[PDB]
Amino acid sequence: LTGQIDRALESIHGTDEAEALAVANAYRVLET
Amino acid sequence: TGQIDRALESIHGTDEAEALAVA
Amino acid sequence: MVISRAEIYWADLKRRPVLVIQSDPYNASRLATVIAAVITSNTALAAMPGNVFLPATTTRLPRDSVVNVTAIVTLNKTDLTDRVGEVPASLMHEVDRGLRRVLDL
Amino acid sequence: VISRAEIYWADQPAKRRPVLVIQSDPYNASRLATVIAAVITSNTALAAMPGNVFLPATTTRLPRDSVVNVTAIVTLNKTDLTDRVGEVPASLMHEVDRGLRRVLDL
Amino acid sequence: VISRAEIYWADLRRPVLVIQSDPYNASRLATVIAAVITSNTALAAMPGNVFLPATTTRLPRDSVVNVTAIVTLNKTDLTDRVGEVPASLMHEVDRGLRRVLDL
């Protein structure tokens, strides 16, 4: 599992909207 | 077999790749 | 609107699509929040183990989609506005498999 | 190296709150930059909500008694988790697994 | 040397994914079994079928393995080796093949 995850992340360089906007939205839940 | 049938209605047009298979 | 699982909504996360993964019992309840997975348009993310590709012809979305099972969000039920469409049970089984994979369930 | 069942403190100001790692260890030990977690509250009344799991302070090393809110799931950057509070026993993580499968229909 | 999980261009030109096992591939058998790869991503709604991003296959466009379209080709009809499908995506392909073939 780990190996294929790393391999796929090599193609998708940087960070995607989902891998970020999720980290963004998280703060709203914890605040409420 | 509805699951297969549901997806078939989604692709109203059949792919010519599957046709070449018969060939 | 009675939000149900497997449905795709547009959500301000930057309006982007989300896939409801919270079960319908919790959805039809007085709980104000719903859990969802973020849907991306970067189809290359379908190579990531567990992620699920979604063709636009299936989702009613503009472009082809990928369920990012590593991007999980908790949104207010009011934050879900545009009900785009529903994901078939065969593709949601792929989503369910991925969620159990990434969450060890 | 973040592992499952571990409790971390997570971040206008900041309002730091505790979280329980639910992302599987294969995905944790990978180059994936994000980790999935369930929010830990101090409102023990939320243990009445179905699926939620109560956590005694003698077990978590947290200040007060805690409740894992399986309906509050967040995705955080792996770098945001620094101060490791502790690890949840396997018997209570089975309760967490039971709750998570309930709310996620898994 | 045709090996499993490899994608080749096949004479109609369309791509194919080798599903025949490597023992039969490394043999003098003149045929190799493959699943037809389409560019109609809408076929990813089919239960057994497996989506393949072009960034993964090295193919021109995004791809979908149609596990219900299986072919037996002569080994000479395979000319351009495009690339190989990772074992994680090939596990999904194997699941579809066993599903459609009841194996």
Numbering used by the authors:
A (entry chain I): 46 to 77
B (entry chain D): 47 to 69
C (entry chain A): 1 to 13, 23 to 114
D (entry chain B): 2 to 12, 20 to 114
E (entry chain C): 2 to 13, 24 to 114
Sentences reproduced from the published study:
The final model contained three toxin monomers (chains A, B, and C) and two antitoxin monomers (chains D and I) with a space group P3121. These molecules formed peculiar combinations: while the toxin dimer comprising chains A/B complexed with one of the antitoxins (chain I) in a stoichiometry of 2:1 (named “the complete complex” hereinafter), the remaining toxin (chain C) associated with the other antitoxin (chain D) in a stoichiometry of 1:1 (“the half complex”). The β1–β2 loops of the three toxin molecules were still disordered while chains I and D resolved residues Leu46-Thr77 and Thr47-Ala69 of the antitoxins, respectively. The binding of the peptide did not change the structure of the toxin dimer, which is common among the MazEF members. The peptide formed two short helices (α3-α4) situated across the deep crevice formed by the dimer, and the α4-helix was located in the proximity to the loops. The total buried surface is 2392.8 Å2 between the MazF-mt3 dimer and its contacting MazE-mt3 monomer. Taken together, most intermolecular contacts are from the α3-helix and the α3-α4 loop. In contrast, the last helix (α4, fragment Thr60-Trp82) or the second-to-last helix (α3, fragment Leu46-Gly59) of the antitoxin exhibited minimal inhibitory effects. It was the peptide corresponding to the last two helices (α3-α4, i.e., Leu46-Trp82) with a molar ratio of 1:4 (antitoxin/toxin) that reduced the cleavage of the enzyme by 15%. MazF-mt3 represents scenario 3, where the cross-subunit loops remain open upon the binding of MazE-mt3.
To better reflect the specificity of MazF-mt3 in M. tb, the so-called MORE RNA-seq was developed, which identified the cleavage sequence as U↓CCUU. Here we report crystal structures of MazF-mt3 in its apo form and in complex with the C-terminal half of MazE-mt3.
